Amino acid sequence: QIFVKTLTGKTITLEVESSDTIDNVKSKIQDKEGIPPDQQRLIFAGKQLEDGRTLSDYNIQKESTLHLVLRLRGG
Amino acid sequence: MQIFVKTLTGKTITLEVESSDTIDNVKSKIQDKEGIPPDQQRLIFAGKQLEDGRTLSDYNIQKESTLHLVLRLRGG
Amino acid sequence: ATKQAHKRLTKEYKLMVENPPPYILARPNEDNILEWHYIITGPADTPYKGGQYHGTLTFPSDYPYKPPAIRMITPNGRFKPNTRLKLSMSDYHPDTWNPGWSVSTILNGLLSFMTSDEATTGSITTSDHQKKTLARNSISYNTFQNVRFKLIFPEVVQENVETLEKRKL
Amino acid sequence: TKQAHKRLTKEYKLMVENPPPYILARPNEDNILEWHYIITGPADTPYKGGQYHGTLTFPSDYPYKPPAIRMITPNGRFKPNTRLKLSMSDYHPDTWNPGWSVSTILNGLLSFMTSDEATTGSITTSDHQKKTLARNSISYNTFQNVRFKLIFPEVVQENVETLEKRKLD
């Protein structure tokens, strides 16, 4: 159980596990919000997260608040 | 009174017209001064086209005002 | 730029410095006699009143035998920017072209067609609020978002900054 | 336009009520489509203490197309006054969610600026240059940024007081 502040400013809760991947976290966010994972970027205390990793890779303790900022890509 | 008309080749002609004269009458006078295809061209003042049926007074074209001829190709 | 095109455009430039057509200021690129730049000042009794519209006349290398390519750069609501506009005296009508026509007549044809509402290739459909909105924003566009305007008309950029500062006072 | 004016008027109120962290933004009082932002450099980034002025130019079809993003203050990350090629990662690159708030767009811009990803408009400098431009950014906006003085007159007053305090220590 962790929290993430959405783009609308609201705070949602996610049924997750430290084993689950960042991408699966975003899939749960898509189920809650609708923003597809390709259009997602998550910050934690001033640094971003990689999709291929899991929650344990960033040693995120349960019931932590994450900031969801909109991803933006460019070539 | 007198007015001025800049032709397509940049030349300036002088016409003897009256405020009652229609833009179509003015165009006809141009053809008398110099062979003109009236259907092929239009007259401009204040940056806007002038319609044939209206008068110089309606367009407030006072004396010594200069009108400009532009090409009017209808086949888009 | 042929010798004949260079002589003609220099004479046409000289004629437009002496007697410029109403609402139209134009001069060529110092580095390219064939690339002219114009500024249309929006006439009264039109939704473009007070607007500053920057465009270009790209003359072909074999001028005065082929017509130039007319474009407008400033967002105006009448023409699609950076698109060749189909006008009576333009490169869309090569067979009708007459070498004796002056450059001022070409610009007056563009200005008169702009203040009318006849459709043509390159024209766009907008409302009156949109035309008047772009007319107000035109000065700010040419001053800060138009590189070619800043390179060709540096003194007008300075006049525009003065105009905008005073409006903010 | 009426739809975008009401939406952008709502966006501004939401931003006044709860501004995004490090970001200030307001629309041009003469053009609701042109917003001006000020980014304050985060602590961990080399842009710390930097005052960063930029624009958000919303298209006429708002809220159906993304805005054009530019940066005015020299910063070391983006080329000044250059439109940044920022798209939304998707199967179709030309995707824009009409429901994204202005605060969402600016927060994504800052998150990109803090990263090292390259795009059209990204410049390659060192870290000593980003820190130097961050220190002189306040001076630039106060004396060398005409649009800053027009849009943020009170922030100019905060800058002159700040620089006088910077002489101390």
Numbering used by the authors:
A (entry chain D000): 2 to 76
B (entry chain C): 1 to 76
C (entry chain A): 2 to 170
D (entry chain B): 3 to 171
What's in the article?
We also determined the structure of a ubiquitin-conjugated form of Ubc6 to 2.6 Å resolution. To stabilize the linkage between ubiquitin and the UBC, we mutated the active site cysteine (Cys87) to Lys, resulting in an isopeptide bond in place of of the native thioester. The asymmetric unit contains two copies of Ubc6-Ub, both adopting so-called “closed” conformations. These conformations are characterized by contacts between a hydrophobic patch centered on Ile44 in ubiquitin and the crossover helix α2 in the UBC domain. The Ubc6 active site is virtually unchanged in one copy of the heterodimer when compared to the ubiquitin-free form. However, in the second copy, there is a drastic conformational change for residues Lys87 to Trp98. The backbone of the C-terminal ubiquitin tail is traceable in the electron density map, but most side chains in this region are not well resolved. The conserved Ser89 forms hydrogen bonds with the backbone amide of Leu73Ub and the carbonyl oxygen of Leu71Ub. Analysis of [15N,1H]-HSQC spectra of Ubc6 coupled via a disulfide bond to 15N-labeled ubiquitin G76C showed chemical shift perturbations (CSPs) typical of closed ubiquitin conformations, confirming that such conformations of Ubc6 are also prominently present in solution. Our X-ray structure of Ubc6-Ub, the structure of Ube2J2, and our MD simulations suggest conformational flexibility in the active site loop, leading to the displacement of the catalytically important histidine residue away from the active site cysteine.
